[PDB]
Amino acid sequence: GSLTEDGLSYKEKFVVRSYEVGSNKTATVETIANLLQEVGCNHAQSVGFSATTTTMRKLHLIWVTARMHIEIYKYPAWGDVVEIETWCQSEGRIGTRRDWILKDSVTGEVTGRATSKWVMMNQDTRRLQKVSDDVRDEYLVFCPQEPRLAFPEENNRSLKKIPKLEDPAQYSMIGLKPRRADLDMNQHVNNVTYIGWVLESIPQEIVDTHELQVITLDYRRECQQDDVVDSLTTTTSDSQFLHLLRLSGDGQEINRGTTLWRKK
Amino acid sequence: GSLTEDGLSYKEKFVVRSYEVGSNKTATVETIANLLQEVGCNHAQSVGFSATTTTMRKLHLIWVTARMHIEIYKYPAWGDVVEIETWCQSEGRIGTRRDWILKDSVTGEVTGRATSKWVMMNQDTRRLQKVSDDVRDEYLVFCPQEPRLAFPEENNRSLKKIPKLEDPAQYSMIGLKPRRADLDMNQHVNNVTYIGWVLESIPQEIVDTHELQVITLDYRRECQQDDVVDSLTTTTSNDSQFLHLLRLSGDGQEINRGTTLWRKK
Numbered sequence: 414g415s416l417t418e419d420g421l422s423y424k425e426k427f428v429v430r431s432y433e434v435g436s437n438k439t440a441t442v443e444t445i446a447n448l449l450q451e452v453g454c455n456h457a458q459s460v461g462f463s464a465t466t467t468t469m470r471k472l473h474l475i476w477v478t479a480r481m482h483i484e485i486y487k488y489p490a491w492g493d494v495v496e497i498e499t500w501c502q503s504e505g506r507i508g509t510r511r512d513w514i515l516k517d518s519v520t521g522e523v524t525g526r527a528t529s530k531w532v533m534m535n536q537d538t539r540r541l542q543k544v545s546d547d548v549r550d551e552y553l554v555f556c557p558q559e560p561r562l563a564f565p566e567e568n569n570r571s572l573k574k575i576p577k578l579e580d581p582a583q584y585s586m587i588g589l590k591p592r593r594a595d596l597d598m599n600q601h602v603n604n605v606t607y608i609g610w611v612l613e614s615i616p617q618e619i620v621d622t623h624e625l626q627v628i629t630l631d632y633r634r635e636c637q638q639d640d641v642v643d644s645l646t647t648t649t650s651d652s653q654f655l656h657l658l659r660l661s662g663d664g665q666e667i668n669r670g671t672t673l674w675r676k677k
Numbered sequence: 678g679s680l681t682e683d684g685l686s687y688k689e690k691f692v693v694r695s696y697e698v699g700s701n702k703t704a705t706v707e708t709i710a711n712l713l714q715e716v717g718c719n720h721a722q723s724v725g726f727s728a729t730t731t732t733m734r735k736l737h738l739i740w741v742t743a744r745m746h747i748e749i750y751k752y753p754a755w756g757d758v759v760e761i762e763t764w765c766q767s768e769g770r771i772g773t774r775r776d777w778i779l780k781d782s783v784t785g786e787v788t789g790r791a792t793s794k795w796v797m798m799n800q801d802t803r804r805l806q807k808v809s810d811d812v813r814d815e816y817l818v819f820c821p822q823e824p825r826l827a828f829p830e831e832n833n834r835s836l837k838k839i840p841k842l843e844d845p846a847q848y849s850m851i852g853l854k855p856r857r858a859d860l861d862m863n864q865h866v867n868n869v870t871y872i873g874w875v876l877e878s879i880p881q882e883i884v885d886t887h888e889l890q891v892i893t894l895d896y897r898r899e900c901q902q903d904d905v906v907d908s909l910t911t912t913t914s915n916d917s918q919f920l921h922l923l924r925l926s927g928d929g930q931e932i933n934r935g936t937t938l939w940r941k942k
């Protein structure tokens with residue numbers, strides 16, 4: 414992988430692996446989500462990062478994901494090369510936004526796109542902060558200054574409010590626990606695990622006959638290594654679903670989201 | 678990746694990914710196990726498979742893993758290039774063997790090695806069988822004819838008998854279930870998931886202070902998408918040795934048995 418000529422975005426090719434594909438012999442949405450995360454880490458490293466930006470390290474500040482939105486048109490097949498282009502942008506003092514475009518390396522056509530909103534947080538108190546200058550000046554040297562949006566459309570799926578699932582849920586997967594493979598190098602549950610846990614309550618009949626076109630996910634609280642999660646789903650309709658991840662015990666909300674599926 | 682000059686083995690370089698590493702910023706043993714599986718699939722495809730032969734497809738036969746043995750000296754760090762060389766060999770009518778050598782792409786030194794025994798099974802009845810003559814000739818064209826062993830040694834840990842864990846276990850992880858990411862393209866639980874499930878009963882203190890040097894795993898029965906697994910461990914020992922057992926949560930049916938060896942960091 415490498416930064417583009419202007420140094421304001423980063424590109425990387427990935428060959429789809431055998432264990433990365435599902436029953437259709439195409440990459441799973443979790444494989445896609447891991448590749449977005451990977452190209453994002455390489456972009457951050459190529460422009461001199463740890464995630465932290467020097468002034469975040471002096472203030473014990475970290476970036477946490479608030480939202481993740483992914484729209485796939487075609488899933489790359491096992492053995493295909495997929496090229497992902499990523500870039501960052503400041504959103505005033507709200508937070509930071511990371512966007513991605515996925516292309517077929519052979520045809521050069523867009524096969525998917527993604528967007529994510531990150532909020533500032535103190536890693537000790539776990540308290541959300543607003544982007545207090547300085548960080549915003551150091552982010553301006555690596556970001557495009559004119560807006561560059563993977564989802565430009567006025568009134569689009571990536572910025573819609575997500576409601577809370579009402580009990581009883583139509584479908585459920587109870588007792589989900591993270592194992593060591595679900596943790597990252599800092600022992601926190603990978604943001605991709607939440608996507609997998611959300612999809613666990615989708616019936617196998619929907620998976621076998623439909624393709625996941627869109628997924629939007631809100632992140633409210635992190636799941637601990639020793640926490641148990643319940644995944645809840647309800648059809649709201651193409652097939653549309655409303656999702657909710659909560660702690661098995663007290664019912665504390667950790668995630669909420671929506672998925673859109675089309676018949677194959 | 679590509680086959681070697683003689684066409685009797687296959688090589689592939691892999692750059693270690695951010696989500697593939699643990700607390701030490703080095704690849705997990707499950708990442709290593711996925712890369713061995715990946716280079717094995719590419720070797721099989723490069724020599725005209727898809728991993729059944731023509732005779733196996735005609736008879737509804739598949740290869741199932743009976744044993745997986747991995748010995749790591751150095752785990753590649755996040756961002757490093759690792760090169761894996763793999764090859765197959767016929768073991769008469771018993772089954773087949775797949776071997777791997779892992780090297781640091783920069784220094785060219787061996788940083789790990791692995792071996793796996795595969796047995797023939799009818800896809801429908803699930804009954805094991807000895808390799809027929811037609812199958813032995815079909816892969817003798819892709820295998821070295823003189824023995825080539827990743828673990829040559831007189832009495833190596835790769836061929837040792839594994840005993841059955843006695844109740845009560847010292848450590849345990851109960852209620853392990855596979856999710857969709859644990860399934861392969863044919864909807865069967867990935868062999869690497871079993872490794873992860875085995876390691877779930879190892880205490881977090883051992884993981885934090887030791888490095889996994891060796892792991893040997895016996896496969897007896899497959900875990901279904903709707904099956905629940907219990908992982909059991911007992912210390913059998915500066916080095917730490919463990920005895921492991923995976924069994925179905927309900928009836929206590931054995932699915933796996935194994936041993937791990939760890940050294941202090």
Ligand SMILES: COc1ccnc(N2CCNCC2)n1
Pocket residue numbers: 477478479532539540541632633634635
């Ligand atoms: C804004 O999204 C997120 C995501 C993950 N954790 C959190 N906080 C919320 C404040 N308490 C600590 C955890 N917020």
Ligand SMILES: COc1ccnc(N2CCNCC2)n1
Pocket residue numbers: 741742743796803804805896897898899
């Ligand atoms: C020897 O290795 C394995 C691995 C997985 N399943 C099996 N069988 C044994 C026979 N019954 C069906 C399952 N054997």
